[PDB]
Scaffold this active site. Structure first.
Site, PDB file in Angstrom:
ATOM      1  N   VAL A  26      33.152  31.087  35.271  1.00  0.00           N
ATOM      2  CA  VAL A  26      34.161  30.036  35.186  1.00  0.00           C
ATOM      3  C   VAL A  26      34.916  29.931  36.506  1.00  0.00           C
ATOM      4  O   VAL A  26      35.503  28.844  36.753  1.00  0.00           O
ATOM      5  CB  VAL A  26      35.199  30.291  34.057  1.00  0.00           C
ATOM      6  CG1 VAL A  26      34.660  29.819  32.730  1.00  0.00           C
ATOM      7  CG2 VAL A  26      35.580  31.769  33.990  1.00  0.00           C
ATOM      8  N   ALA A  27      35.569  36.214  41.348  1.00  0.00           N
ATOM      9  CA  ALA A  27      34.815  35.620  40.204  1.00  0.00           C
ATOM     10  C   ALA A  27      35.283  36.185  38.850  1.00  0.00           C
ATOM     11  O   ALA A  27      35.597  37.375  38.697  1.00  0.00           O
ATOM     12  CB  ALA A  27      33.312  35.798  40.387  1.00  0.00           C
ATOM     13  N   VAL A  28      35.346  35.283  37.877  1.00  0.00           N
ATOM     14  CA  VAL A  28      35.807  35.581  36.541  1.00  0.00           C
ATOM     15  C   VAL A  28      34.766  35.066  35.583  1.00  0.00           C
ATOM     16  O   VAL A  28      34.107  34.056  35.844  1.00  0.00           O
ATOM     17  CB  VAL A  28      37.145  34.842  36.269  1.00  0.00           C
ATOM     18  CG1 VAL A  28      37.574  34.993  34.830  1.00  0.00           C
ATOM     19  CG2 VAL A  28      38.232  35.358  37.196  1.00  0.00           C
ATOM     20  N   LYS A  43      37.608  39.453  34.781  1.00  0.00           N
ATOM     21  CA  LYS A  43      37.711  39.258  36.224  1.00  0.00           C
ATOM     22  C   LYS A  43      37.255  40.488  36.965  1.00  0.00           C
ATOM     23  O   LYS A  43      37.805  41.564  36.770  1.00  0.00           O
ATOM     24  CB  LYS A  43      39.167  38.983  36.619  1.00  0.00           C
ATOM     25  CG  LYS A  43      39.384  38.748  38.104  1.00  0.00           C
ATOM     26  CD  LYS A  43      40.807  38.407  38.381  1.00  0.00           C
ATOM     27  CE  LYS A  43      40.953  37.793  39.750  1.00  0.00           C
ATOM     28  NZ  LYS A  43      42.329  37.275  40.006  1.00  0.00           N
ATOM     29  N   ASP A 140      51.057  31.863  45.116  1.00  0.00           N
ATOM     30  CA  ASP A 140      49.817  31.133  45.003  1.00  0.00           C
ATOM     31  C   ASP A 140      49.708  30.197  43.801  1.00  0.00           C
ATOM     32  O   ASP A 140      48.619  29.989  43.244  1.00  0.00           O
ATOM     33  CB  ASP A 140      48.631  32.086  45.036  1.00  0.00           C
ATOM     34  CG  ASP A 140      47.357  31.388  45.492  1.00  0.00           C
ATOM     35  OD1 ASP A 140      47.479  30.542  46.400  1.00  0.00           O
ATOM     36  OD2 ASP A 140      46.266  31.648  44.941  1.00  0.00           O
TER      37      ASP A 140
HETATM   38  N1  LIG Z   1      42.527  34.435  31.173  1.00  0.00           N
HETATM   39  C1  LIG Z   1      41.756  33.340  31.600  1.00  0.00           C
HETATM   40  N2  LIG Z   1      41.286  32.391  30.785  1.00  0.00           N
HETATM   41  C2  LIG Z   1      40.558  31.332  31.153  1.00  0.00           C
HETATM   42  N3  LIG Z   1      40.188  31.089  32.414  1.00  0.00           N
HETATM   43  C3  LIG Z   1      40.633  32.030  33.284  1.00  0.00           C
HETATM   44  C4  LIG Z   1      41.452  33.215  32.935  1.00  0.00           C
HETATM   45  N4  LIG Z   1      41.720  33.976  34.047  1.00  0.00           N
HETATM   46  C5  LIG Z   1      41.088  33.310  35.045  1.00  0.00           C
HETATM   47  N5  LIG Z   1      40.448  32.163  34.594  1.00  0.00           N
HETATM   48  C6  LIG Z   1      39.668  31.339  35.378  1.00  0.00           C
HETATM   49  O1  LIG Z   1      39.048  31.859  36.542  1.00  0.00           O
HETATM   50  C7  LIG Z   1      39.259  31.005  37.664  1.00  0.00           C
HETATM   51  C8  LIG Z   1      39.677  31.854  38.855  1.00  0.00           C
HETATM   52  O2  LIG Z   1      40.538  32.909  38.287  1.00  0.00           O
HETATM   53  P1  LIG Z   1      41.465  33.841  39.194  1.00  0.00           P
HETATM   54  O3  LIG Z   1      42.185  34.901  38.287  1.00  0.00           O
HETATM   55  O4  LIG Z   1      42.482  32.965  39.863  1.00  0.00           O
HETATM   56  O5  LIG Z   1      40.519  34.656  40.293  1.00  0.00           O
HETATM   57  P2  LIG Z   1      40.463  34.381  41.857  1.00  0.00           P
HETATM   58  O6  LIG Z   1      38.903  34.349  41.972  1.00  0.00           O
HETATM   59  O7  LIG Z   1      41.214  35.484  42.624  1.00  0.00           O
HETATM   60  N6  LIG Z   1      41.002  32.999  42.251  1.00  0.00           N
HETATM   61  P3  LIG Z   1      41.586  32.533  43.587  1.00  0.00           P
HETATM   62  O8  LIG Z   1      42.164  33.720  44.483  1.00  0.00           O
HETATM   63  O9  LIG Z   1      42.696  31.398  43.359  1.00  0.00           O
HETATM   64  O10 LIG Z   1      40.410  31.916  44.404  1.00  0.00           O
HETATM   65  C9  LIG Z   1      40.434  30.144  37.173  1.00  0.00           C
HETATM   66  O11 LIG Z   1      40.382  28.861  37.800  1.00  0.00           O
HETATM   67  C10 LIG Z   1      40.261  29.978  35.657  1.00  0.00           C
HETATM   68  O12 LIG Z   1      39.249  29.082  35.316  1.00  0.00           O
HETATM   69 MG   LIG Z   2      43.446  35.802  43.911  1.00  0.00          MG
END
Ligand SMILES: Nc1ncnc2c1ncn2[C@@H]1O[C@H](COP(=O)(O)OP(=O)(O)NP(=O)(O)O)[C@@H](O)[C@H]1O
Ligand SMILES: [Mg+2]
Ligand SMILES: [Mg+2]
Length: 329
Positions: A26, A27-28, A43, A140
């Site tokens: 949806v 990395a997560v 995540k 952020d």
């Molecule tokens: N609890 C959750 N439920 C649903 N979607 C989620 C959840 N946590 C994260 N996501 C998704 O995962 C995507 C990226 O999550 P994120 O926790 O921000 O990791 P990130 O890869 O560090 N992002 P970023 O640093 O902004 O590039 C989000 O746009 C949501 O779609």
């Molecule tokens: Mg981040």
């Protein structure tokens, strides 16, 4: 189920618990707790011990998430690592409840609407008031770091760049289009108000549908903002500490402040007023999350424990490993 297992998601390899099933990116990843049937979000901290900057963030993200507790701030259900010893402990996974989709995607598919936009922003702000009252700074807030489920409930995501508010913080923070001007004009000395800036750009985006200040580079972002908020007095920019910022603002034309109602086509009067209060150039006069909530815009909708804390690559790795194993669901 019990134990662990591995799977090819996109390009990356995950080693989640046997219980967390049917992974989907949806990395997560969105998984299902095999034990209950409830969708979950997993995540994977991307090579957290590849540097000191990465390690520091990983530990800060774990720590803050383990500490915070609010209806509008994502929470941990589980945290694990498929590494049995500190020696080969390379990574760890965070488990949070699946929250639907993020505001970014939600906005790409559909236009929001007065009642919706209000409810959503109200929630961003209660979450913010909590994070701030707790002495934390997010750094952020953007549509992509805000989750919204089917019942329009919101939870602030991604504390990967968050930390405890202090006097002199790291300079390059916040995603560009949501970055407040002082992050650059006032290198390393911005405050929790930067999160209010981000909320304004976000609220503004929900209404218009377009990114408010889409700049090409960090300096150009200033210009985009300035075209709307006007430019500061010439005598101020003269004394700017940051050379880079001073030179840029110098060459820049002399822009005048535009009325916000002139930008937000079909927005409401109170909405425009709130935005005007959130997007002020002067960090100090800029409304706070508390004040923001108190605004007449949130009319139909109207204490916390401060976070505390106390290095080599192996010190971060060790300090982290400890906070991972000490997690109680
Ligand atoms: N609890 C959750 N439920 C649903 N979607 C989620 C959840 N946590 C994260 N996501 C998704 O995962 C995507 C990226 O999550 P994120 O926790 O921000 O990791 P990130 O890869 O560090 N992002 P970023 O640093 O902004 O590039 C989000 O746009 C949501 O779609
Ligand atoms: Mg981040
Ligand atoms: Mg994100």
């Amino acid at each position: 189920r019990s134990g662990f297992y591995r799977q090819e998601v996109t390009k990356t390899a995950w080693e989640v618990r046997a219980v967390y099933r049917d992974l989907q990116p949806v990395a997560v990843c969105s998984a299902v707790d095999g034990r209950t049937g409830a969708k979950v979000a997993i995540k994977k901290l991307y090579r957290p011990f590849q540097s000191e900057l990465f390690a520091k963030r990983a530990y800060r993200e774990l720590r803050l998430l383990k500490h915070m507790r609010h209806e509008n701030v994502i929470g941990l259900l589980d945290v694990f690592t498929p590494d049995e010893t500190l020696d080969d402990f390379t990574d760890f996974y965070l488990v949070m409840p699946f929250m639907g989709t993020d505001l970014g995607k939600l906005m790409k598919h559909e236009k929001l609407g007065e009642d919706r936009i209000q409810f959503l922003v109200y929630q961003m702000l209660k979450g913010l008031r909590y994070i701030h009252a707790a002495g934390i700074i997010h750094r952020d807030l953007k549509p992509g770091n805000l989750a919204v489920n089917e019942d329009c409930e919101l939870k602030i995501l991604d504390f990967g760049l968050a930390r405890q508010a202090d006097s002199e913080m790291t300079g390059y923070v916040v995603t560009r289009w949501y970055r407040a001007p002082e992050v650059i004009l006032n290198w390393m000395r911005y405050t929790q108000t930067v999160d209010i800036w981000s909320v304004g750009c976000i609220m503004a985006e929900m209404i218009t549908g377009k990114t408010l200040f889409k700049g090409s580079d960090h300096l150009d972002q200033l210009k985009e903002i300035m075209k709307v908020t006007g430019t500061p007095p010439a005598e101020f920019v003269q004394r700017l500490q940051s050379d880079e910022a001073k030179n840029y603002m110098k060459g820049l034309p002399e822009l005048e402040k535009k009325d916000f109602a002139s930008i937000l086509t079909n927005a409401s009067p109170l909405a425009v007023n709130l935005l005007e209060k959130m997007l002020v150039l002067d960090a100090e006069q800029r409304v706070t999350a508390g004040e923001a909530l108190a605004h007449p815009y949130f009319e139909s909708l109207h204490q916390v424990q401060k976070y505390d804390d106390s290095r080599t690559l192996d010190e971060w790795k060790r300090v982290t490993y400890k906070e991972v194993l000490s997690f109680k669901p």
